[PDB]
Amino acid sequence: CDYTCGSNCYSSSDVSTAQAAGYKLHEDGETVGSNSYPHKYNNYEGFDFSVSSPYYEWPILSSGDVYSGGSPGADRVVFNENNQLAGVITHTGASGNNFVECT
Ligand SMILES: Nc1nc2c(ncn2[C@@H]2O[C@H](COP(=O)(O)O)[C@@H](OP(=O)(O)O)[C@H]2O)c(=O)[nH]1
């Protein structure tokens, strides 16, 4: 696993595929789903990402398919304005409604 979000195993290609879809919607000024993804990720957690902000979050699914406006699940891909990967985060293993980084 390139990224492990709890029990979910993601390859660098799974991440790139998810990021490409979120980035396209972001550039178009459109959102999908009840929680309006992609949307700004403020970094309340204070992760030390090595790429510049603003950051946007988009769901990454354990099933392998691109988020299509339904349930977002626990996992997210975080990218910036230049389509650079900031990180992969999850609610799994975090307290409250916070996120932890996938390893
Ligand atoms: N845990 C966490 N959730 C975030 C972060 N940024 C955005 N979110 C979630 O996305 C929601 C919508 O994002 P937005 O703020 O960019 O519009 C936020 O709602 P709240 O505004 O109630 O915090 C929050 O629940 C962040 O840095 N950490």
Numbering used by the authors: 2 to 104
In the authors' words:
Lenz et al. published the structure of ribonuclease T1 (RNAse T1) with the nucleotide guanosine-3′,5′-bisphosphate (pGp) bound. The structure was determined from an in­complete (90%) 3.2 Å resolution room-temperature data set collected on a four-circle diffractometer with a sealed-tube source. The same group later determined the structure of RNAse T1 with pGp bound at a much higher (1.8 Å) resolution. The pGp ligand-binding position differed from the previous low-resolution result, particularly in the positioning of the guanine ring. In addition, a phosphate anion was found to be bound in the catalytic site that had not been observed in the low-resolution structure. Accordingly, it was decided to re-solve RNAse T1–pGp. Positioning the pGp ligand with rhofit and subsequent refinement (with target LSSR) strengthened clear density for a separate tetrahedral anion in the catalytic site. Following Lenz et al. this was modelled as a phosphate. The pGp ligand conformation, its binding contacts and the positioning of the phosphate anion in the catalytic site are consistent with those described by Lenz et al. for the same complex solved at 1.8 Å resolution (see Supplementary Material1). It can be concluded that BUSTER ML refinement with target LSSR allows the most important features of the pGp T1 RNAse complex to be found from low-resolution data.
